Design an enzyme around this catalytic site. Structure first.
Site, PDB file in Angstrom:
ATOM      1  N   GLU A  63       9.309   7.535  -2.156  1.00 39.98           N
ATOM      2  CA  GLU A  63       8.858   6.125  -2.215  1.00 39.98           C
ATOM      3  C   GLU A  63      10.065   5.257  -2.518  1.00 39.98           C
ATOM      4  OE1 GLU A  63       5.806   5.244  -4.981  1.00 39.98           O
ATOM      5  OE2 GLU A  63       5.483   3.171  -4.134  1.00 39.98           O
ATOM      6  N   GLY A 106       0.818  -1.225   0.000  1.00 46.74           N
ATOM      7  CA  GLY A 106       0.000   0.000   0.000  1.00 46.74           C
ATOM      8  C   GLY A 106       0.847   1.269   0.000  1.00 46.74           C
TER       9      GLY A 106
END
Ligand SMILES: Cc1cc2cn([C@H]3C[C@H](O)[C@@H](CO)O3)c(=O)nc2[nH]1
Ligand SMILES: Cc1cc2cn([C@H]3C[C@H](O)[C@@H](CO)O3)c(=O)nc2[nH]1
EC number: 2.7.1.145
Lengths: 212, 217
Positions: free
Chosen positions: A93, A21
């Site tokens: 990320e 996620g």
């Protein structure tokens, strides 16, 4: 001196297995894009290297494409690390650290990087460490069960549960155990839960919720 | 800032084909070791990479080992470029620039790097240009005809080099011409050319160190 010592905003690395996620958790910070430098994993650069799709070519023939693929991936993360900003916060990320301690390491174990190649990458990582400033202030670990991660990946790429198990243990070794050289502190989220609503107790003063 | 902007000695790059007499030319600076940072090709690092010998494997099976070999070779040249010194002159045997413009290009042309690999290496070279200070003040080009360099390689029999065909030397000759004579590559500095078809054993010997015993009373 190291390259890009002037890039020193508070730098948060979001780490997690495939299907933890990460994309959801990152999307939640978009409301703050005026005050936060938000960098999502640069898949599109991996899909298009001056013409070539390194990502397909690697999940097709990993024995051949491992070294070049991880080499380019490492560069793109290094660009994100060194990318200057006038914002006080950068959230990335993944990181060069997940490339080195997780993906490269798994590729060596699965025999896709022989010892010759592995040693060359490690020598480069040591050089990168000595030569390039990498601000890392905080890691958020989206910690999952491989079982739960596999369910999410079905919704796409041909990736086995066993690959996710391998990546899980290396993430556990790095972020829970302390078996890699640890740059910074780690906070753990139980990314087995749905994270759609995380942080929503915090609202921007500028939100219409606070209009008269 | 770039890495190692402090390493700023007058830096001279010796460039040439395999067989251009680079080892002879470099050895003549040995008398200047106290005032020059003399850095020869780190072949020994390429023959032992935490146990592995990369040079052997590249000349054995170039198609497999080209990407790794040239990536590590690139690293070892960066370590020489960025190596600090209190001496006012650094002289290096070859450079990251010969790695990029000659050896990597030649491996792409010969199909030992696919486009994917070549593009990845180019992106890194561009990042290295942006991130790392590389002092380059002068190139000395030991220019040869491929045939004279072929002959020199035969006369040595240096195990790895022995089987290099003339066609390979011609290829690397044309890449040096394109970079050091033709200026088809981004050029950082001036180039002086030696005719390395000639023997260079005695080059520079009109100049003698004052400390030489030839000027003792
Ligand atoms: C830093 C880093 C990211 C990354 C992503 N990937 C792959 C796994 C996922 O299927 C896809 C999207 O994250 O990229 C990889 O194989 N090695 C990687 N290393
Ligand atoms: C920078 C650089 C030096 C270098 C040397 N070599 C080889 C050519 C000779 O046979 C040997 C010593 O010059 O190493 C190579 O294949 N690629 C290289 N790149």
């Amino acid at each position: 001196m190291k390259y890009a010592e002037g890039t020193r905003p508070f730098t948060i690395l979001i780490e997690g297995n495939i299907g933890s996620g990460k994309t959801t958790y990152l999307n939640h910070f978009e409301k703050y894009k005026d005050d936060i430098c938000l960098l999502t994993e640069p898949v599109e650069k991996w899909r298009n290297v001056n013409g070539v799709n390194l990502l397909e070519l690697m999940y097709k023939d990993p024995k051949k494409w491992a070294m070049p693929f991880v080499s380019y991936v490492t560069l793109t993360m290094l660009q994100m690390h060194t990318q200057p900003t006038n914002k006080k916060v950068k959230i990335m990320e993944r990181s060069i650290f997940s490339a080195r301690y997780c993906f490269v390491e798994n590729m060596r174990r699965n025999g896709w990087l022989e010892q010759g190649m592995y040693n060359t990458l490690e020598e480069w990582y040591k050089f990168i460490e000595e030569s390039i400033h990498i601000q890392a202030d905080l890691i958020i670990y989206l910690r999952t069960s491989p079982e739960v991660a596999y369910e999410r990946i079905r919704k796409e790429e041909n990736v086995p549960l066993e690959y996710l198990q391998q990546l899980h243990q290396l993430h556990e070794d790095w972020l829970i155990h302390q078996r890699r050289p640890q740059s910074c502190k780690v906070l753990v989220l139980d990314a087995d839960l749905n994270l759609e609503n995380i942080g929503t107790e915090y609202q921007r003063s500028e939100s219409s919720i606070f209009d008269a």
